Design a protein around this ligand. Structure first.
Ligand SMILES: CCCCCCCCCCCCCCCCCC(=O)OC[C@H](COP(=O)([O-])OCC(O)COP(=O)([O-])OC[C@@H](COC(=O)CCCCCCCCCCCCCCCCC)OC(=O)CCCCCCCCCCCCCCCCC)OC(=O)CCCCCCCCCCCCCCCCC
Ligand SMILES: CCCCCCCCCCCCCCCCCC(=O)OC[C@H](COP(=O)([O-])OCC(O)COP(=O)([O-])OC[C@@H](COC(=O)CCCCCCCCCCCCCCCCC)OC(=O)CCCCCCCCCCCCCCCCC)OC(=O)CCCCCCCCCCCCCCCCC
Ligand SMILES: CCCCCCCCCCCCCCCCCC(=O)OC[C@H](COP(=O)([O-])OCC(O)COP(=O)([O-])OC[C@@H](COC(=O)CCCCCCCCCCCCCCCCC)OC(=O)CCCCCCCCCCCCCCCCC)OC(=O)CCCCCCCCCCCCCCCCC
Ligand SMILES: CCCCCCCCCCCCCCCCCC(=O)OC[C@H](COP(=O)([O-])OCC[N+](C)(C)C)OC(=O)CCCCCCCCCCCCCCCCC
Ligand SMILES: CCCCCCCCCCCCCCCCCC(=O)OC[C@H](COP(=O)([O-])OCC[N+](C)(C)C)OC(=O)CCCCCCCCCCCCCCCCC
Ligand SMILES: CCCCCCCC/C=C\CCCCCCCC(=O)OC[C@H](COP(=O)(O)OCCN)OC(=O)CCCCCCC/C=C\CCCCCCCC
Ligand code: HEC
Ligand code: HEM
Ligand code: HEM
Ligand SMILES: COC1=C(OC)C(=O)C(CC=C(C)C)=C(C)C1=O
Ligand SMILES: COC1=C(OC)C(=O)C(CC=C(C)C)=C(C)C1=O
Ligand code: FES
Lengths: 242, 354, 95, 92, 65, 326
């Protein structure tokens, strides 16, 4: 049959050549991830220090990390202890192994969301579409308990409960908390998490691309100059013109 | 070597009537050097232990590591674009009729390149690369015990990566040596012109041809810089950023775009070996397309109708490869393969006299 | 190298080692020629690109029009296949 | 390998202004997307008629076989393309 | 070059003298390989055969060029 | 000649040229090459004004048949038979090569044989209409084509050297900037990574410590004991500060502590690396239980197998209640 429905092309700010990741949206996205997605997903490759001076100030990131409890060790007696989190810790993981996670989601495994913004065709658009793509099942399709219909998931039936409900959280900045906002914001944040160096890449790219154009014009004038010698010569056999 | 350089760069005479399609080769050589350098530098920060996390660690922790990661991936796409365009050119101007030795040296580099690329994507430890080497290794499953020797285990594992990585490190240096054998024949067996005959219109290389060749390479750089930093064209499949799970099969086990012409051949033919064999035919028959001719002519600068239908056959097969294995695409694709053979036969056959 | 008559040299001075390839591309000019030229420093270096612009693109598009009929047959086949795939999927599935 | 394909900003039709989401009688903000659903369904009426037809054809079948997922996925893809063109204008 | 009345004309005469002249068939008391003229000496060494069968400098002056 | 090959073979499907010439086989034969008409002094066919008036061409478009790519050419490499077909030179057919030597087409009735064979020199045959058709170019730049005469600048033009060298220089200016940036960024990647820098330097918050408490911070893989020292502890080390030179490793407490209240030391026994435990030993300092080394309240070895004093790490005080290790 056909491949999973292609996600629509959403007009995110960062899609233009000279545009950045909107930090205000990324901040709200962290809140959505921490209060909704984190219950079942983990971001193993996202560390708190990645957000310092980029999404949140250093003191704020300390408070966020300290809110969680991690298992460190061993101590001098060879035992494992629990400490508050630090800026060097990865984002907390809800389940200890993949088998524990699967046992808590009807056998389904909540994928790590570290690179999910670029792990599906459509990229960021796939996250926005998926989270806003839950619908009543098509006629003739009946879904068991714990199975929900979504137009963008391959197959149509996803084991993830519809995660975004209006009023689920209160944004610190006062932005109205509606399902579509949370989607736009968590998609933004996960896109940032995938490649936190996105803005450096695009600012240095801007300086390279523009410089390369000036470079093209210099080598072109040079090419035009030296080849004039060749392209305007006159070879005569029985004729002479000066 | 300075005298050698002067003989092959400064006092090297080339016809003044060549187009910009005679600059493609210069670009291959430059982009090839860039791929070796970037590869050696990436390896400074990553090895074979766990590529998935290693690529993440390069793009997030190394300073300007993102540049190295994306250049090495995108410059591969670029290498294969320029090479494939270099072949299309050589077919159009039939630059194999009198310079077969140059053509043979090039084909050797093409074979080496096709192995270098396949194995680089398994170094990323991604789902689509894990399950695409598991499906290409099982084509030599007929030769007894050979799969086990290559893989090093009964399933693809870190053991398979530790060994292919050495082939990926070393084979490019050998390719650079064959590039010298290629430039050796080109300089002895003079290059072909846009005109079928040989004319006294040659000019030195450094003062003219290198200035023009740089205008070309800088044009391509402008475009490659835009892709390198903004991904204007999707040249890398997204499913290689999914951690390897050996239990779940990817949505589609397809190669990278520059192996979709031989992936389709393998998915269209009904017998596995027939497919393998038709993939040998594609890379081998093109090396004897002037051998059976008997007329004093190089079949050059005609309308090249057969050439055009061949270039389109390649593009159309790449399309069928992207598509899922739907029956209607398989039937139409089998006709495109039958058509390629007839077009190839037309190149090969000598002509009788009225 | 060029033909053995073309690369045959009139002079007895030895071929310099750095000019081996240069003198393997020698031609025996028959009847003579009078080659002339002017330094690019005393010429217009971009005008000829403009002067030759229309004819260059006319003679390019007239040659590339040879492939029109081939191109149309291939696109007709592309459309037929696309529609055949869609109708086949709707027939196998799609109640 | 990457989340998005880059484009010129003139090709990226970003909302030029922001219209706040409507407030309900209760006072809770109503989802802009939910309000846009009926309007975008009308824009995709042709596919919706195809889906509605399927529903009635499978309703007649006296066996239990028959689904209309294929036609629903075409309608949904259409309704969603419509939403994408105007939803971010109501979102901060 | 320079016109007759140019202040630099004598300098150009001297430069013409420095270039000098050389003929393989009239080398003089000093051979080319050991000539004080730098052009002659380096030329006489090329390929162990000499790259100048004959050469001479020239300095031609007119009223305004 | 280089390794080369010619398809000079006896074909099974294609006839030799002597049997089926592919050229328009009408030639004019002369007694001596000088008797041929001169192309340069021969009037050519009248010029035309429309491409649809250009004369017709003697070639046969369908000279070759069979499967294969289209070609029009006059010649092939095929071998000729021992007894070639006699050419009809009376009607203008060409006689050259094998069809002259291995045939008797050259024989005349009464002419001396030496004279007869002389007329069949390949130079005595030229295609009909040769002098009226071959283009005799006088230049490679035909009238109406651009050349240096038209592109030459006016004699009052300004020097174009200064700008040319600006352009070649700008190619060098931008190139060198790209090279600097490339090289500098590659070497920069060898600098300790972002994760490595973060762990390396560790700021330790001294707020909340109580006098006499010892805490351990893992810094660069090693235990770093940070102990607030009570006045009794400080005085104890000060007392041994006078008995210096009676210690295995004579060091004064002032040279081991930046602030008397705070002792930051690496907790690695100098004997065999075991980690000492605080508030243990004979000096109430740090006792390594492995082999029995006793250190004082300043970390100086006072008894045991250990040879040296516990090392003082690189650390500064950011403020009064914060240290930075590294
Ligand atoms: C269809 C055309 C098919 C034939 C193409 C030409 C083939 C040919 O002989 O060229 C070979 C070419 C040699 O050509 P040549 O005649 O000897 O001259 C070369 C130059 O002179 C070398 O010149 P140079 O030395 O100066 O180097 C510069 C050269 C360097 O580049 C090249 O050498 C070029 C090579 C060929 C490129 C052909 C590109 C054709 C693009 C057509 C685009 C159409 C868009 C329509 C959009 C409509 C939207 C509604 O650049 C050019 O010459 C560029 C010329 C212009 C390119 C086309 C520009 C199209 C503009 C259209 C504007 C429309 C505006 C509409 C406004 C309406 C307003 C209301 O080289 C090769 O033999 C191989 C080259 C590698 C590519 C080969 C590709 C072959 C297959 C083409 C497939 C096309 C797509 C699929 C179609 C079918 C689908 C079912
Ligand atoms: C979807 C469509 C699929 C279609 C599939 C089939 C397509 C077949 C297309 C080609 C055949 C068309 C029909 C041929 C009828 C018979 C022709 C004949 O007797 O020719 C004599 C005739 C000689 O006349 P000529 O004018 O004097 O030739 C002058 C030449 O310059 C010669 O220059 P030279 O004087 O230097 O001589 C060079 C020498 C060079 O010869 C050699 O290198 C000799 C060794 C190789 C060829 C012969 C042995 C091959 C292996 C046989 C099996 C061995 C089993 C051993 C088992 C041991 C167990 C203990 O060749 C010759 O002397 C002439 C023979 C040329 C080679 C081909 C001979 C076999 C023809 C049949 C080909 C296969 C058809 C398969 C059909 C399958 C079912 C549909 O040749 C020609 O007419 C010209 C050549 C035409 C054929 C070119 C073939 C190119 C190479 C590829 C062939 C396969 C292409 C398709 C493969 C597709 C899948 C991979
Ligand atoms: C001797 C002393 C020398 C002192 C030098 C100090 C200056 C210096 O170096 O500082 C750097 C410092 C700035 O350093 P920076 O910020 O790192 O540099 C800028 C960025 O690097 C630049 O940004 P970025 O690096 O992030 O950007 C990327 C970069 C690099 O990008 C990359 O490399 C990226 C690609 C990496 C690839 C990596 C993988 C490679 C793999 C292998 C590839 C193989 C190929 O590429 C570019 O940016 C390209 C730029 C291209 C040129 C742009 C300009 C074009 C102009 C066009 C003009 C022509 C058109 C005119 C039209 C006019 C129409 C009217 O300079 C300044 O702050 C500037 C002012 C300097 C004033 C100096 C005053 C000296 C005073 C001396 C006083 C001495 C007194 C002594 C007293 C006692 C006597 C006894
Ligand atoms: C009951 C029903 C029974 C039906 C049986 C039907 C059997 C039909 C079998 C047909 C076989 C036809 C084979 C033709 C192969 C021609 C190959 C050829 O040209 O050989 C080239 C070459 C050399 O041929 P050559 O040296 O004679 O030179 C040929 C060169 N020309 C054509 C220019 C004269 O063959 C070999 O080298 C032999 C290889 C095999 C060993
Ligand atoms: C994907 C890979 C990475 C891509 C991005 C990074 C690309 C980096 C590419 C760097 C190329 C650097 C080339 C620098 C060349 C500098 C010199 C040059 O050519 O200048 C012109 C000049 C030539 O100038 P010229 O030939 O006009 O000489 C005239 C000299 N005067 C004026 C004194 C009479 O070249 C040189 O200086 C010589 C070396 C070349
Ligand atoms: C040719 C252009 C190739 C692409 C260049 C590129 O990506 O430029 C980036 C950027 C486009 O950003 P957008 O997000 O689309 O902004 C729209 C308005 N805010 O372009 C610009 O900033 C302006 C265009 C480039 C100007 C370059 C000038 C220097 C070179 C001159 C050479 C002579
Ligand atoms: C917070 C808003 C989120 C986000 C951004 C995502 N989820 Fe979930 N999710 C859950 C389960 C069990 C699965 C796997 C189901 C299976 O596919 O059968 C998923 C899957 C995802 C994906 C991947 C989709 C893909 O095609 O694999 C993504 C991108 C995703 N989720 C994002 C379960 C849950 C929850 C359990 C109750 C909660 C809460 C969330 N997800 C929340 C979020
Ligand atoms: C690693 C890939 C290769 C590189 C580095 C490369 C390099 C070059 C170079 C520099 C030239 C001379 C400049 C030119 O005319 O463009 C050239 C010529 C040529 N190459 Fe390659 N090449 C490669 C791939 C191939 C392949 C795969 C083939 C054969 C299918 C091939 C066949 C030829 C031929 C026939 C010529 C001569 C063209 C003419 O007659 O001038 N090359 N190549
Ligand atoms: C013909 C030259 C080469 C080509 C065509 C080639 C191709 C590629 C490809 C396609 C990738 C996958 C990129 C990705 O994961 O998407 C890869 C990975 C890699 N290559 Fe190369 N390569 C070349 C030479 C080299 C060389 C000489 C080295 C250095 C020893 C090297 C080192 C690496 C490394 C370490 C990786 C894994 C990191 C990565 O995924 O980017 N390569 N290569
Ligand atoms: C995943 O990587 C690859 C494939 O996966 C299906 C291929 O088909 C192919 C094509 C293989 C053959 C045998 C033609 C290559 C080279 C490849 O890189
Ligand atoms: C047989 O080798 C191949 C080529 O060279 C002739 C191609 O042109 C192509 C087609 C290339 C492009 C740019 C469509 C591919 C993929 C190929 O496999
Ligand atoms: S290791 Fe401390 S006493 Fe020996």
């Amino acid at each position: 049959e056909k491949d999973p429905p292609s996600p629509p092309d959403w007009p995110f700010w960062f899609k233009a050549f000279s545009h950045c990741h909107d930090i205000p949206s990324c901040r709200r996205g962290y809140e959505v991830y921490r209060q909704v997605c984190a219950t079942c997903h983990a971001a193993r490759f996202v560390c708190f220090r990645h957000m310092v001076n980029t999404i949140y100030p250093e003191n704020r990131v300390k408070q966020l990390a300290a809110s969680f409890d991690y298992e460190d060790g061993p101590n001098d007696r060879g035992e494992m202890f629990t400490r508050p989190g630090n800026l060097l810790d990865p984002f907390p993981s809800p389940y200890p192994n993949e088998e524990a996670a699967r046992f808590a989601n009807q056998g389904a495994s909540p994928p790590d969301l570290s690179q999910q913004a670029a792990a599906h065709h459509g990229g960021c658009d796939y996250i926005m579409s998926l989270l806003t793509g839950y619908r009543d099942p098509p006629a003739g399709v009946s879904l068991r308990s714990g199975l929900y219909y979504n137009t963008y998931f391959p197959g149509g039936a996803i084991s993830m409960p519809p995660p975004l409900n209006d009023g689920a959280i209160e944004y610190e900045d006062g932005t109205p908390a509606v399902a579509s906002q949370m989607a736009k914001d968590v998609s933004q944040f996960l896109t940032w998490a995938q490649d936190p160096q996105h803005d450096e890449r695009k600012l240095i790219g801007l300086k390279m691309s523009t410089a390369a154009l000036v470079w093209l014009f210099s080598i072109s004038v040079w090419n035009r100059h030296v080849w004039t010698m060749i392209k305007t010569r006159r070879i005569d056999f029985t004729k002479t013109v000066y | 070597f300075i005298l050698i350089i002067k003989d092959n760069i400064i006092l090297y005479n080339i016809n003044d009537s060549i187009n910009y399609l005679w600059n493609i080769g210069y670009i291959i050589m430059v982009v090839m050097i860039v791929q070796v350098i970037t590869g050696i530098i990436i390896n400074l920060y990553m090895n074979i232990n766990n590529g998935y996390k290693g690529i993440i660690y390069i793009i997030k922790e190394i300073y300007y590591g993102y540049i190295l990661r994306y250049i090495h991936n995108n410059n591969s796409t670029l290498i294969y674009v320029v090479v494939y365009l270099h072949i299309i050119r050589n077919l159009y101007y039939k630059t194999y009729y009198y310079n077969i030795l140059i053509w043979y040296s090039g084909m050797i580099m093409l074979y080496q390149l096709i192995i270098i690329g396949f194995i680089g994507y398994i170094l990323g430890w991604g789902q689509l690369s894990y399950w695409g080497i598991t499906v290409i290794i099982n084509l030599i499953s007929g030769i007894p015990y050979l799969i086990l020797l290559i893989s090093g285990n009964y399933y693809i594992t870190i053991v398979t990566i530790k060994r292919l990585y050495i082939v990926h490190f070393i084979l490019p240096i050998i390719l650079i040596y064959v590039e010298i054998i290629h430039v050796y024949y080109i300089h002895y067996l003079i290059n072909n012109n846009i005109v079928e005959y040989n004319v006294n219109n040659k000019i030195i290389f450094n003062n003219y041809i290198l200035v023009k060749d740089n205008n070309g390479i800088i044009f391509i750089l402008n475009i490659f810089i835009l892709e390198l930093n903004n991904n204007i064209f999707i040249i890398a499949d997204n499913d290689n950023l999914i951690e390897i799970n050996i239990l779940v099969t990817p949505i589609h086990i397809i190669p990278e775009w520059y192996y979709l012409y031989w992936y389709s051949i393998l998915k269209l033919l009904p017998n596995k070996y027939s497919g393998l064999y038709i993939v040998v035919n594609s890379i081998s028959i093109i090396n004897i397309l002037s051998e059976y001719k008997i007329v004093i002519s190089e079949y050059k600068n005609y309308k090249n109708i057969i050439w055009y239908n061949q270039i389109i056959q390649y593009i159309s097969m790449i399309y069928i490869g992207i598509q899922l294995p739907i029956i209607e695409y398989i039937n139409y694709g089998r006709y495109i393969i039958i058509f390629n053979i007839l077009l190839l036969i037309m190149y090969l056959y000598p002509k009788k006299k009225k | 190298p060029n033909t053995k008559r073309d690369i045959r040299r009139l002079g007895s001075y030895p071929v310099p080692p750095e000019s081996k390839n240069f003198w393997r591309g020698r031609f025996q000019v028959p009847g003579g020629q009078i080659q002339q030229g002017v330094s690019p420093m005393q010429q217009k270096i971009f005008f000829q690109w403009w002067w030759n612009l229309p004819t260059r693109y006319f003679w390019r598009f007239t040659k590339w029009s040879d492939f029109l009929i081939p191109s149309l047959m291939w696109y007709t086949g592309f459309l037929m296949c696309k529609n055949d795939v869609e109708e086949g999927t709707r027939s196998r599935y799609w109640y | 390998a990457r989340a998005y394909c880059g484009r010129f900003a003139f090709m990226l039709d970003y909302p030029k202004s922001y219209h706040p989401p409507r407030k309900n009688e209760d006072g809770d903000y109503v989802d802009p997307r939910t309000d846009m659903l009926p309007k975008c369904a009308a824009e995709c009426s042709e596919w919706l008629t195809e889906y509605n037809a399927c529903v009635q054809r499978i309703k007649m079948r006296t066996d239990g076989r028959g689904n209309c997922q294929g036609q629903y996925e075409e309608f949904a893809m259409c309704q969603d393309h419509c939403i994408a063109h105007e939803l971010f204008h109501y979102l901060k | 070059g320079v016109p007759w009345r140019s202040p630099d004309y004598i300098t150009f005469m001297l430069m013409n003298a420095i270039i000098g002249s050389y003929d393989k068939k009239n080398e003089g008391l000093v051979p080319g390989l050991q000539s004080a003229n730098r052009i002659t000496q380096t030329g006489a060494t090329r390929m162990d055969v000499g790259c100048f069968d004959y050469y001479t400098g020239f300095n031609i002056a007119y009223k305004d060029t | 000649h280089r390794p080369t090959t010619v398809k000079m073979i006896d074909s099974w499907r294609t006839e030799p040229s002597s049997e089926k010439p592919m050229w328009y086989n009408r030639f004019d034969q002369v007694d001596h090459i000088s008797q041929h008409p001169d192309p340069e002094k021969t009037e050519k066919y009248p010029p035309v004004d429309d491409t649809r008036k250009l004369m017709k061409t003697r070639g046969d478009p369908h000279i070759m048949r069979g499967w294969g790519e289209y070609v029009y050419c006059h010649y092939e490499h095929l071998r000729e038979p021992v007894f070639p077909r006699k050419p009809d030179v009376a009607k203008g057919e060409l006689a050259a090569g094998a069809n002259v030597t291995r045939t008797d087409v050259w024989k005349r009735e009464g002419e001396p044989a030496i004279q007869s064979i002389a007329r069949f020199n390949p130079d005595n045959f030229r295609p009909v209409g040769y002098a009226e058709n071959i283009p005799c170019p006088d230049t490679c730049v035909p009238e109406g084509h651009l050349d240096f005469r038209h592109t030459r600048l006016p004699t009052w033009h300004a020097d174009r050297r200064p700008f040319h060298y600006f352009a070649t220089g700008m190619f060098g200016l931008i190139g060198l900037a790209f090279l600097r940036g490339t090289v500098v960024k590659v070497v920069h990647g060898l600098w300790p990574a972002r994760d490595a820098i973060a762990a390396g330097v560790i700021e330790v918050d001294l707020r909340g410590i109580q006098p006499g408490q010892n805490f351990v911070v893992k810094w660069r893989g090693k235990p770093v004991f940070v102990r607030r020292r009570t006045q009794a502890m400080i005085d104890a080390a000060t007392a041994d500060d006078a008995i210096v030179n009676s210690l295995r490793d004579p060091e004064r407490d002032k040279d081991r502590v930046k602030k008397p209240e705070w002792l930051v030391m690496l907790g690695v026994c100098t004997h065999l690396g075991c980690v000492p435990y605080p508030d243990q030993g004979l000096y109430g300092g740090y006792f390594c239980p492995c082999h029995g080394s006793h250190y004082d309240h300043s970390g100086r070895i006072r008894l045991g197998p250990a040879p040296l004093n516990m090392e003082i790490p690189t650390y500064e005080f950011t403020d009064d209640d914060t240290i930075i290790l590294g």
